[PDB]
């Protein structure tokens, strides 16, 4: 019960951090190294 | 006196008040009979968060500050990291100014050809 509550708190925290890692990887500039910016 | 090391800030801005400092020391490898550089990365406390990646800084021993932090920036020897950020910010406006200027010049030259 208390172990389950703590486990789910930790699971939510870990999943939030993984999702934010992905979003940070997505929140980058991503300029084309060959052609540069579009215009 | 306290342990002091000289190193390059190789990772900043990813942890609150913590940077990563790469230090190198001279060691003798007897297996190859050579004086080598032994490299290591330290997690270092940065009160004020003044350091940036690429700065040459002197780190000094302190009390344990976390599980892995035992050193703090004691002095910024060379501050190339701050200069890089300054030029990054300045170039944004600097470029755009003449980018608009020369676009104006191009359009004016086009119009001059148009009315010939």
């Amino acid at each position: 019960s208390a172990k389950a509550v703590k486990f789910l708190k930790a699971q939510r925290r870990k999943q939030k951090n993984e999702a934010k890692q992905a979003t940070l990887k997505a929140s980058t500039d991503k300029v084309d190294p060959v052609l540069g910016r579009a215009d | 006196a306290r342990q002091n090391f000289l190193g390059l800030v190789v990772s900043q801005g990813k942890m609150q008040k913590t940077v990563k400092v790469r230090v190198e020391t001279k060691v003798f490898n007897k297996k190859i009979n050579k004086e080598l550089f032994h490299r290591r990365d330290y997690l270092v406390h940065d009160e004020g968060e003044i350091s940036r990646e690429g700065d040459l800084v002197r780190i000094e021993a302190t009390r344990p500050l976390s599980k892995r932090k035992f050193f703090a920036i004691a002095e910024i020897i060379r501050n190339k990291g701050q200069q890089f950020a300054l030029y990054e910010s300045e170039a944004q406006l600097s470029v755009a100014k003449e980018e608009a200027q020369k676009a104006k010049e191009f359009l004016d030259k086009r119009s001059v050809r148009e009315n010939k």
Binding site: - | A1, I50, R58, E60, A74, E75, I76
Partner: protein
Amino acid sequence: GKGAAKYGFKSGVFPTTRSILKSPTTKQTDIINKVKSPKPKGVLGIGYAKGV
């Protein structure tokens, strides 16, 4: 036992000699002046810089 060559070929050890006076005394002006000297900065700096 070739390590003994590093210590005058003396095998075995003695307990390290204790110091009668465990801190520098006041009648030693060289150490007093050395500690009470300005502290260097830069590559061989000892301490925190002015603005840090």
